[model samples]
Target: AKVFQWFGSNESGAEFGSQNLPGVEGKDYIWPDPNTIDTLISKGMNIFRVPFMMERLVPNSMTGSPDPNYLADLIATVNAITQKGAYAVVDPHNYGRYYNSIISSPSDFQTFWKTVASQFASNPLVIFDTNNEYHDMDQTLVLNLNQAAIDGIRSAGATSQYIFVEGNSWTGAWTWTNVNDNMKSLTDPSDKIIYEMHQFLDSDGSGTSATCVSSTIGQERITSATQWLRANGKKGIIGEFAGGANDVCETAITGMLDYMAQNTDVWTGAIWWAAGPWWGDYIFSMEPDNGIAYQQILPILTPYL
Candidate 1:
């Protein structure tokens, strides 16, 4: 299948032209409005990756049912995109209680996925990601949580929906030891599991200059990590990856994309982390009017697209 990737997010606060800060509230956060979506679609972007906080969608309880309003909005958004003949992936960016915490038990993980699965089971365009990233957890724990999420989703009758499972630590590192055993034994009768990983040029969140690393290093790292998935009979997805205009970081990102292009069989898709101002000034949250960044990176991405 041909792969399509695009940058997007959940909620009004994260949207373009929305207020940036501690006090930005409902309705004030709106950008990438109908116009924004239309522009992106026109740019040949067929896939939209949107992130949502489960608490905001199902505030009453972690394992409880999702809010009707939230569900309605989510379904509507997906319909809007698919109505235009595009594909949409619904990613649960935050699972409330699991935010910034190590998920210790299988039940805690199961409950979360069950809630999401039950709500979006009927939506063919919606994809369920177990969690964003399993930070600060042991390798064993990460695998278990992912498995439990798959179980929950299948139990809820979403057999054909694709489920994205990421590695530990913000999905940046690709440590096979952390994920191999689980993938080897994971038995998904529905055949709907997809491996996911996130990447960025800088170790720090700031878009400042960083050390340049050889493209070969990135290639070796990704090759070794996904070797485990391939051995276990699965391919992987770069759910997120990006770098700023900083010379070193941009070079690294370029190298990474080169590596990806060279190893297309193993990489299913790569989504850029962002496309707007929150990614730039940290003040105004809007995609830059200038298409400089897009112009710079689009060449590299066009081949894959």
Candidate 2:
């Protein structure tokens, strides 16, 4: 196995406030900080998963043009990361929904992707993650959404960059085979698509808590997904994964990274969930603080990079 190629954190901030749509930028939502990204890059992290509110980008309709102001901010954020020679993953952090409703039309979602894909088509390092976690929805619908995203991306002439597709049930790697086996049928014209899975070491795999299940829980949870990827000859990325800043979690997190490194053929790498200026006191925050809880977890993740 080889070392994972992409290693970084989810620069999360712009996706905040699901209740406040089209809110004020600095007051309601904000983009990742440039200085924090530069610091991470200096530490050998080459990829940053940056998530944004889809509604903020496309304020009127799913297929409508993005709000110019919002687009400008997003472009600046993307440029900030990519200019430093780091991969920027543009993720619409909506969980298979818009306005608290499940997205029903694959065609509309396709249109949305077309607009987004066109913007970053020139940048090969800009990755398009279709959507965040999709749960409590029709499995077939999830599959179609992903396929439409792939089609829309390639249709916009963004054929070279990788398109990351999330599965049903929060895209959990543990339950992927049981909940999202249908994802194997998704097709991409460019064949540059990858399965994006999220895993948490917590007992429920929700990523809400810091306590991990066990030191080997990470490897155990992702075992099935790895097998499925190998069997299908597809690539994957751990789009989100985190644990508490404890001895058990450190061992567990490191164990997970080691497993992925050992199986790098199908596993590209993982993005910690997350790091941004606003995540103060957030247990899983990796915001480069002064040796606090969040900073303590950094060394465990940085070695893989």
Candidate 3:
């Protein structure tokens, strides 16, 4: 399996004229690279997670018809990476919800995937990540929503592509079981059920801080996450994870990498947290012009990739 290194998520420059992604309290990161994917591909990165805002997809309404321009642009972004001999995760970075509560009603969640899936049904390189980092929601309901998303993709005739589903509580490592526990309930026609997991080394497990409070704080989650995967006969990939260039952060990052390398059966691949335009100089940013994590860590990760 190919390892991922998320270059940048925001891919709405041509769609919404949007400047940034919703995270980082609204820091936009588009149009900076101009050629971000192939550049990273040349550097040994094989997969990229491309994120798009929900509002951008169905700009006028949640349940309303999707914007054609936005959908086309989004497809272009996916093809851009996939065409370059790398994989791309068509990520709807909507945090497990379209607005507030994740209900079973007629929402844009299913509509979004159905639309995107039908468009890229023939592209083997595109992977649909149902949503990213869902928080404050029940795992059972999320799984149901995930099942719906998967069903939507297949119904749209996108049967050959892979679909990734992340658990609630922001897809945290400790929350792997949040969705993994409900894996028994999942039914996919496409037969692609890769679980997405993320890890952060901060004391609070949030990737916001540059300082690594406890290097071992996030390690236990990996042990539990892997065991669950093995027990269930499932596959997993780290869609997002990061620590700074410091020794403490390096220890946590490298330790996890080593763990993944040692357990390739259940853990398919892992992607570093971020590298995007406008992420400029952020604590975990991988932008070469400013952030230092990529340069400091890439050499160590290349051998494994």
Best prediction by TM-score:
2
* Candidate whose lDDT is highest: 2
Every model's Cα RMSD, please?
4.4, 1.4, 3.8
In model 1, residue pairs whose N, Cα or C atoms come closer than 3 Å (at least 3 residues apart or on different chains), thus clashing, are: 276-287, 277-286
Sequence-dependent TM-score of model 1: 0.78
Poorest stretch of ten by lDDT in candidate 3 = 7-16
Ranking, lDDT, top scorer first: 2, 3, 1
lDDT scores of the candidates, listed in order: 0.58, 0.89, 0.69
| Residue pairs with clashing backbones, model 3 | 7-275, 20-28
Model 1, CA-based lDDT: 0.58
Give one clash count per candidate, in the order shown. 2, 0, 2
Candidate 2 lDDT over residue span 111-188, tens digit each: 999999999999988999999999999999999999999999999999889889999999999999998988999888
The residue ranges of model 3 lying beyond 4 angstroms of the native Cα positions read 1-34, 101-103, 106-108, 178-180
Per-residue C-alpha lDDT of model 3 across residues 178-288, encoded as one tens digit per residue = 455875567788778888888877778788887776666546668889888888888888888777778887777667777776777888787776776656566766665
